[PDB]
């Protein structure tokens, strides 16, 4: 039951991982930190899906 | 026209075989010996194969208004001669155990070879009739050879009444066409009024009995169970091989066969022949009835090529190569069945349940039956696949989608019973001319394998023969 | 040059094993091992000597080595063997699986053993010939002649003619379900060639000129369905996969190694090579049906895997779940997705082969096939269940195994092209865990008193452990370090994708 | 509900229909020779009818 429940969370975790590569390209944390505001001049609505599902 | 030496060289196949009947009949009346009669008959048929080279020295020409000699007829005469050669070599081991009068067999097979090599050469509707009946009278009488059993006579009588009935339908159709047309010559015919078409349908009935088509196939099980296995070699291969040539030539030459009214009817017969063969063929546990069931489906594949003879010139060689492959497959399979009956044994006990084992009894002979039985189906490395491949190509070429689909689904249905017999020869077990009979079927096994893997040389022969 | 020889060694070895059957009985085992060693030598020589890191945009025709020979000149049918980069991965995989097949059959003497091995080399050589095939008829002939000798394997070696369940259901469904669709794709080949013959006026059966043949819309769609039907009965797709569990549960597990690890490869090879480039607009229209069938296959195979009580049918129903990822990968417009399918596909073979070898190994240890009958064998076996735990672990997406990087780059590319069908697809990993744990707990976790026969257990020999150790270490290096084979396949995958992109 | 596999069974119905239809065709054969000749007449009837509708 722990194994099933932790893999449900890991599916939820990998969902945000797909979205971050689709939106910001690089998955390194720091390069992500000063790449996130550069790519987000126009659209922001989909980042809540990334971050809520990351959460 | 009169007789010229060109006509005699053209007629040389019909002549050598006829001289053989006379010499065989004189030899029978002189000594009544099995060894001398077998030797004399096989020498004449081998002399007919040698003389095929000499008619190849002659070109495409006529002998009489009854016959036309082309290179197409050269190949069909060859198919019939090897089947006659095949049936005498399979009959000597079966007839050594026969009680008496063991010498009339070769005389009747020789008459049937005359009939076969007369339907190869055809140009007039009467030659069509002189050929059908010359071959039937030995097939009237040879399925009734060894009438001492309770089923050979049964088989002979069923085939006798039905074959006379088909000949009466063919003759009545043959005249109802000639009422419209001024001549019965194939070419001169058709020079779409209903009487000519109605006469044509009657000839289809009289021809589709012997070609084992869908509403006339009822004889093909019973006589194949009843007849001797040496007779079944000739009855499966030579008769229908010779008969298919004349029915193809009638539609090629006659302008009435160009019309779609006859084309639709023959296509439906071909459609139903494949289906009504390959569905009732599954349940059989008898090898002779099993081969008789497959014969109906093989003649159906020939028809789905013949319907598209008039669309594209590839149908000529397609029919020719499937006939060559079909000859070799059935001769090997029926030779193994006859080679299991090395004595007369009264009634031979052959069945699919009787063929458990047979690899630890006789391993070489089981391999021949398996190779030929896989060649009947459509498995590659066998000549049947190349023949199957051309009939699919012909149906694709002529946009006969229902017919080519029938071949595939008929192949899909018919794979099942061929494979059981192939594996049933691997379950747990329950004289000089005999070695010669083994050599004939083993020679055919080598040929079907090398012409399945390497099929070009047979195509070169076929395009050499086709005009 | 090397290609005629590399498809012929399997057939030459079958002739020689059966020749030396009269000389001896311990010969064909040792003959067969060396002959498959020569097969991998030529395959690995092409990997090393060839320019595997070649130009990514050198067109659709690109081949490290190429053979041409006239076979039937009337239709232009030629022996057009030609090896690409991804085709070379397929050849090296089947050479390795052939070594495993001939190693698992070691110490297996019978009434006849040369017959078994000539058939064994014949079927493995048939798969090699499909993998090297550019001419359509040569491709079809090889596709259909690797299919006949397995029937004799399931028939005469499924069990030695004692029970009739090893032929009339298992082997017969295996044979018919493949051959009817093989004839379907043959008439598909012929309809394509005839429309090309109307267009140009030459009877050709070659892939390069049939690649760009002009066809009107609404015509090539039917031919694409005709190709896909034969390519959907060989790899397990949703409507037609009933042959797979019966075939794997009855054949000997060496025949099952051939039936699972490498016969499942050739259909997705053909979807990448022969179906996608020939029919770009038909495949673009057919794409969403392929995605729906792919997601249905993953969920369906896992449920049927969870619900089953035996082991051979259990791993046989993992395979149908695995191939759904591959089908969705192929029917998308992404280069990364295709390169994920290749690594997932090689790992699929390597993760099914070890399990089947070990399931057959466990049966001959205990003489009992039902999984729920045993339980708690860990205190008895010393190396089987520990190695089996990692192979069940490698089945699902566990990193350090090749399956994780495989399935998961497909998902990256799949979400790149289309969101909603991918977000459904990812949940098969949770279902992959449940049938993986079901196998592990029902077989090995528990008490040995679940079965009376679980109280006297044999030992494990050295060579089986050697060939299990090689697969587990080989599969771990593919999971940790998959770069070398991705650099190999990049250009072949790239031109297929560029043609699928540019031709639409 | 998935203890037995549904789609394997529901695509076996071609074999079910073929075997049952094949059994019906075998039962259609009789062995009495009068109906064989009736088959010949009824083939002639349908061939002439199928030719006269063309």
From Swiss-Prot, chain B:
> What superkingdom does the record give?
Bacteria
Q: Does the keyword Zinc apply?
A: no
Q: What is its EC number?
A: 7.1.1.-
Its GO biological process annotations read: aerobic respiration; ATP synthesis coupled electron transport; electron transport coupled proton transport; respiratory electron transport chain
Q: Which cellular compartments is it found in?
A: Cell inner membrane
Q: Where in the sequence is the signal peptide annotated?
A: none
The entry's stated outcome for residue 1 to H is: Shows 20% of the wild-type rate of deamino-NADH oxidase
Task: State any single GO MF term.
Answer: quinone binding
Q: Which UniProt keywords apply?
A: Cell inner membrane, Cell membrane, Membrane, NAD, Quinone, Translocase, Transmembrane, Transmembrane helix, Transport, Ubiquinone
Residue intervals annotated with topology Cytoplasmic: 29-34, 92-104, 148-158, 217-227, 285-289, 340-365, 424-438
Keyword NAD among UniProt keywords: yes
- Transmembrane regions listed in the UniProt entry: 8-28, 35-55, 71-91, 105-125, 127-147, 159-179, 196-216, 228-248, 264-284, 290-310, 319-339, 366-386, 401-423, 439-459
Enzyme's top EC category: translocase
The consequence of residue 240 to C is: Shows 7% of the wild-type rate of deamino-NADH oxidase
Deletion phenotype: Cells gene grow very poorly on M65 minimal medium containing acetate but normally on rich medium (LB).
The membrane topology noted for this protein in its Swiss-Prot or TrEMBL record is: Multi-pass membrane protein
According to its record, what are the GO cellular component terms? membrane; NADH dehydrogenase complex; plasma membrane; respiratory chain complex I
Q: Which reaction does it catalyse?
A: a quinone + NADH + 5 H(+)(in) = a quinol + NAD(+) + 4 H(+)(out)
Q: Which residues lie on this side of the membrane: Periplasmic?
A: 1-7, 56-70, 126, 180-195, 249-263, 311-318, 387-400, 460-467
Q: What role does this protein play?
A: NDH-1 shuttles electrons from NADH, via FMN and iron-sulfur (Fe-S) centers, to quinones in the respiratory chain. The immediate electron acceptor for the enzyme in this species is believed to be ubiquinone. Couples the redox reaction to proton translocation (for every two electrons transferred, four hydrogen ions are translocated across the cytoplasmic membrane), and thus conserves the redox energy in a proton gradient.
What else is noted? Answer: A construct which produces a protein lacking the first amino acids has only 5% of the wild-type rate of deamino-NADH oxidase.
Q: Spell out the subunit comment.
A: NDH-1 is composed of 13 different subunits. Subunits NuoA, H, J, K, L, M, N constitute the membrane sector of the complex.
Family classification: Belongs to the complex I subunit 2 family.
Record-given protein name: NADH-quinone oxidoreductase subunit N
**What is the gene name?**
nuoN
Curated annotation (Swiss-Prot), chain C:
Give me the Gene Ontology terms describing cellular component: membrane; NADH dehydrogenase complex; plasma membrane; respiratory chain complex I
Q: What is its EC number?
A: 7.1.1.-
Please list the reactions this protein catalyses.
a quinone + NADH + 5 H(+)(in) = a quinol + NAD(+) + 4 H(+)(out)
Q: Which domain of life is it from?
A: Bacteria
Q: Name one GO molecular function term.
A: NADH dehydrogenase (ubiquinone) activity
**Record topology, Cytoplasmic segments:** 22-29, 104-121, 195-221, 280-285, 335-339, 447-464
Which Pfam families did the record assign?
A: Proton_antipo_M
> Which keywords, in A-to-Z order, does the entry hold?
Cell inner membrane, Cell membrane, Membrane, NAD, Quinone, Translocase, Transmembrane, Transmembrane helix, Ubiquinone
TM ranges: 1-21, 30-50, 83-103, 122-142, 174-194, 222-242, 259-279, 286-306, 314-334, 340-360, 383-403, 404-424, 426-446, 465-485
Signal peptide: which range, if any?
none
The way it spans or sits in the membrane comes to:
Multi-pass membrane protein
The cellular location(s) given in this protein's UniProt record come to: Cell inner membrane
A GO biological process of this protein is:
electron transport coupled proton transport
Keyword Glycoprotein set for record: no
Stretches of the chain found on the membrane's Periplasmic side: 51-82, 143-173, 243-258, 307-313, 361-382, 425, 486-504
Q: Which InterPro entries match?
A: NADH_Q_OxRdtase_chainM/4, NADH_UbQ_OxRdtase, ND/Mrp_TM
Tell me its family: Belongs to the complex I subunit 4 family.
Q: How does it assemble?
A: Composed of 13 different subunits. Subunits NuoA, H, J, K, L, M, N constitute the membrane sector of the complex.
The UniProt entry, under NCBIfam families, shows: NDH_I_M, PRK05846.1-1
Please describe what this protein does.
NDH-1 shuttles electrons from NADH, via FMN and iron-sulfur (Fe-S) centers, to quinones in the respiratory chain. The immediate electron acceptor for the enzyme in this species is believed to be ubiquinone. Couples the redox reaction to proton translocation (for every two electrons transferred, four hydrogen ions are translocated across the cytoplasmic membrane), and thus conserves the redox energy in a proton gradient.
Q: What is this protein called?
A: NADH-quinone oxidoreductase subunit M
Q: Give the organism the record lists.
A: Escherichia coli (strain K12)
